[PDB]
Amino acid sequence: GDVAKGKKTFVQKCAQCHTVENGGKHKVGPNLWGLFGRKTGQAEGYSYTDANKSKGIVWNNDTLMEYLENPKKYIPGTKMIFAGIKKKGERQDLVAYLKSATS
Numbered sequence: 001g002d003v004a005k006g007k008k009t010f011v012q013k014c015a016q017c018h019t020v021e022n023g024g025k026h027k028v029g030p031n032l033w034g035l036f037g038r039k040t041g042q043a044e045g046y047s048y049t050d051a052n053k054s055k056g057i058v059w060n061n062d063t064l065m066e067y068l069e070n071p072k073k074y075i076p077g078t079k080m081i082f083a084g085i086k087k088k089g090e091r092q093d094l095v096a097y098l099k100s101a102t103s
């Protein structure tokens with residue numbers, strides 16, 4: 001898991017819609033501070049869809065790796081409109097960074 005390459009991905013692919021830092025604003029999507037170890041649909045102040053709220057699983061390495069490959073198949077109904085990151089190595093690196101930058 002390479003945190004410098006995952007950071008590049010994030011800025012490329014996610015940053016338009018998300019922030020990571022403590023305090024960080026909700027943009028199109030929620031801020032993601034806290035996210036590991038949290039159940040889905042849990043960032044304070046954000047209005048999620050009832051899908052992302054009710055999925056009910058906890059965000060950890062394994063589940064973030066599955067969700068990122070295809071977000072709409074994992075959360076049918078999500079308003080996170082983004083196709084996925086298909087390649088396993090870029091997903092690892094990108095998970096390895098979120099881990100770092102969200103606590």
Ligand code: HEC
Binds near residue numbers: 039080
């Ligand atoms: C804007 C077009 C987005 C892009 C680009 C990415 N995401 Fe996103 N995301 C967006 C929204 C509107 C939402 C809420 C979904 C809903 O159904 O309510 C989200 C949500 C997430 C979540 C879930 C947060 C929760 O607390 O469970 C995560 C973990 C997440 N998004 C991660 C993420 C990453 C890593 C992205 C880059 C590849 C990414 N998102 C892109 C909108 C958009």
